[PDB]
Structure formats: structure tokens, C-alpha cells
Amino acid sequence: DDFAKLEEQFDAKLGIFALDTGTNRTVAYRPDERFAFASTIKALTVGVLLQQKSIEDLNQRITYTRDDLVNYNPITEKHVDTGMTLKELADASLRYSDNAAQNLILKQIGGPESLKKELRKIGDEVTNPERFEPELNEVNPGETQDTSTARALVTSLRAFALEDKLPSEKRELLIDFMKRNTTGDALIRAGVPDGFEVADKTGAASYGTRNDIAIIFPPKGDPVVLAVLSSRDKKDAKYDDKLIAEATKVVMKALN
């Protein structure tokens, strides 16, 4: 009723899945409803990048051009002449949601097809990487291109960040990046209690799609993996971060 209340208040659809890995308790609300995953895919993309490369390997310098810079490139646009290491690209992608960073990493790992193949390998049958940024944000209701579900994103994120799709040093790298995300302050972070660490990746796409996926680290006890996905009825709809923050609060109350 609380999630439905938020949907009502924000004229939005909520997609929620949370797993407290310390109790195996779950919170679900339209967990299997598809949403354009938007930039949350960047987290899973770095996960695959990390699976593919030694930590040292991430020091490879990637040269790119202005062709690669499409819309939102806060970091990559500044280093277009000097290039960026894969690590620096991962940093930009995760922490600034740098689209060109995501695209260059996605190319590095073998493209959307390779990302999808690696997600199927980990048993994510639902996430459908098809396109680069910002093209992947163009998802209509009912279309499955570049979509996933809260359950699938949580399950996949957990696999890379917490489970065994990455060795510990790489998991730590992925977690450190997401912990130091700069784009998520008003989302999942705005809905956790004090002293809870959040490692998150935000996204926003067409139809007022506004997403945040996270691993949340309580003061005591094991991490909670959470996806809060939202979409609205109208193509050019604006989103309200407050919905994600409020939905996160409901999750945390349920897990308490």
C-alpha cells in the first residue's frame, strides 16, 4: 500500500526489488515489471569490464575522438586529446554517469551483444543491452530493448558486487566507484538512515524513467541490494527524485 501510495502521489510506476543479504529477506513491488534501465547499465558494464581485465589491465589508455562524445560527457569531453585509462573511464561512467565513458567501455567489452552474453552467463535472462548511450534511453512502453526489471538488476548487481562473478579486489573497485557516485544524492541515498553507506548508479530515460540501483551497507549486518525503478505514462514526462528516495524509505522500513 505504501509503494502504491507513492505511485499515486508521483503519478509514476514503481519497480522495486530489495535483498537484505544478511537475512535473505526481500522487498518486492512490481519487481518483474520492465523499465528502461538507462544509466544503471553502466554499473553492470563495469562489472563485465572488471571480469575481463586484471586490475593492472585497467591502466590501458583508451584514445577516442569528439565523434564519441554525444550528449552528456562531463569527464570524457575534457580528456578527448589526451585519452583516458579504462579505470578512469570506469570512474567517469560510474561516478559521473559519463555517456562517452560508458560507450567506450561497452566497446571495450565487445559491445551491447557482449554485455548481454555476459549477463546471460551470470543467469540474468531479463536485462537486454541493445544500444549505446544515449540511444538506449529511447524506450517506449512495451518495448524490451535496453530494459530490465528491478529483480534482474538487483540479482545482476549482487552477482558482480557481492557474489562471485568478480574476485574481491575487483568487487572492491566496483563498490568504491559506486560508493563515490556523485549523481545519486537525492535518490536511494536520500532514503537510507544515517551511517548507511550507499554504492549506487542512477539512470534516467524516456517516459520519465528514473532509476537507482545500489548496494546499501548498514552500520551492522550484510549489504542490502536494491533497485528502485520508475517510469511514467508520457514520453517527455519529467521525473521526481523524491519518488526514489521515498520508495527507498519504504524498503528500509520493510527491512526493519
Coordinates of C-alpha atoms in Angstrom, one line a residue, residues 71-185:
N71 CA 25.4 14.4 -25.2
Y72 CA 26.5 14.1 -21.6
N73 CA 30.2 13.7 -21.2
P74 CA 31.2 15.6 -18.1
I75 CA 34.6 13.8 -17.8
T76 CA 35.4 12.4 -21.2
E77 CA 34.9 15.7 -23.0
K78 CA 37.9 17.1 -21.0
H79 CA 40.4 14.4 -21.9
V80 CA 39.5 13.9 -25.6
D81 CA 43.0 15.0 -26.6
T82 CA 45.0 13.0 -24.0
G83 CA 42.8 9.9 -23.7
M84 CA 41.6 8.0 -20.6
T85 CA 42.6 4.8 -18.9
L86 CA 39.9 2.1 -18.7
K87 CA 39.9 2.7 -14.9
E88 CA 39.4 6.4 -15.4
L89 CA 36.7 5.6 -17.9
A90 CA 35.0 3.3 -15.3
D91 CA 35.3 6.1 -12.8
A92 CA 33.7 8.6 -15.1
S93 CA 31.0 6.2 -16.2
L94 CA 30.0 5.2 -12.6
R95 CA 30.5 8.4 -10.7
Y96 CA 29.5 11.0 -13.3
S97 CA 27.4 8.7 -15.5
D98 CA 29.6 9.9 -18.4
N99 CA 27.9 8.5 -21.5
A100 CA 31.0 8.5 -23.7
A101 CA 32.8 6.7 -20.9
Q102 CA 30.1 4.0 -20.9
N103 CA 30.2 3.8 -24.7
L104 CA 34.0 3.3 -24.8
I105 CA 33.9 0.7 -22.0
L106 CA 30.9 -1.0 -23.8
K107 CA 33.0 -1.2 -27.0
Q108 CA 36.0 -2.5 -25.0
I109 CA 34.0 -5.4 -23.6
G110 CA 32.6 -6.3 -27.0
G111 CA 29.5 -4.1 -27.4
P112 CA 25.9 -4.5 -26.2
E113 CA 25.9 -8.0 -27.5
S114 CA 28.9 -9.0 -25.4
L115 CA 27.3 -7.3 -22.4
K116 CA 24.1 -9.3 -22.9
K117 CA 26.1 -12.5 -23.4
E118 CA 27.9 -12.0 -20.1
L119 CA 24.6 -11.2 -18.3
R120 CA 23.0 -14.4 -19.7
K121 CA 26.2 -16.2 -18.5
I122 CA 25.5 -15.0 -14.9
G123 CA 21.9 -16.1 -15.3
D124 CA 20.3 -12.7 -16.0
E125 CA 17.8 -13.7 -18.7
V126 CA 16.0 -10.4 -18.5
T127 CA 18.3 -7.5 -19.0
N128 CA 18.5 -6.6 -22.7
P129 CA 21.5 -4.4 -23.6
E130 CA 21.0 -3.4 -27.2
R131 CA 22.3 0.1 -27.6
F132 CA 24.9 2.7 -26.6
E133 CA 24.3 6.0 -24.8
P134 CA 22.1 8.0 -25.2
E135 CA 20.2 5.9 -27.8
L136 CA 19.4 3.2 -25.1
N137 CA 17.3 5.9 -23.3
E138 CA 14.7 5.8 -26.2
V139 CA 12.4 3.1 -24.9
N140 CA 8.7 3.1 -25.4
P141 CA 6.2 1.3 -23.0
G142 CA 6.1 -2.3 -24.0
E143 CA 9.4 -2.3 -25.8
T144 CA 12.1 -4.6 -24.3
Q145 CA 15.2 -3.1 -25.9
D146 CA 17.5 -1.8 -23.2
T147 CA 15.2 -2.8 -20.4
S148 CA 15.4 -4.8 -17.3
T149 CA 13.5 -5.4 -14.1
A150 CA 14.2 -4.5 -10.5
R151 CA 14.7 -8.2 -9.7
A152 CA 17.1 -8.7 -12.6
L153 CA 19.2 -5.5 -11.9
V154 CA 19.4 -6.4 -8.2
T155 CA 20.3 -10.0 -8.9
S156 CA 22.9 -9.0 -11.5
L157 CA 24.4 -6.2 -9.4
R158 CA 24.7 -8.5 -6.5
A159 CA 26.4 -11.1 -8.6
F160 CA 29.2 -8.7 -9.6
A161 CA 29.5 -6.5 -6.5
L162 CA 28.9 -9.1 -3.7
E163 CA 29.0 -12.6 -5.0
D164 CA 31.5 -14.5 -7.2
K165 CA 31.3 -13.0 -10.7
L166 CA 34.3 -10.9 -9.6
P167 CA 37.3 -11.6 -7.3
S168 CA 37.4 -9.5 -4.1
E169 CA 39.8 -6.8 -5.3
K170 CA 37.7 -6.1 -8.4
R171 CA 34.4 -6.2 -6.4
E172 CA 36.0 -3.6 -4.1
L173 CA 36.9 -1.4 -7.1
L174 CA 33.4 -1.6 -8.4
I175 CA 31.9 -0.9 -4.9
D176 CA 34.3 2.0 -4.3
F177 CA 33.3 3.7 -7.6
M178 CA 29.6 3.3 -6.8
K179 CA 30.0 4.4 -3.2
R180 CA 31.6 7.6 -4.5
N181 CA 28.9 8.2 -7.1
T182 CA 28.1 11.9 -7.4
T183 CA 24.8 11.7 -9.2
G184 CA 22.6 9.8 -6.6
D185 CA 22.4 12.2 -3.6

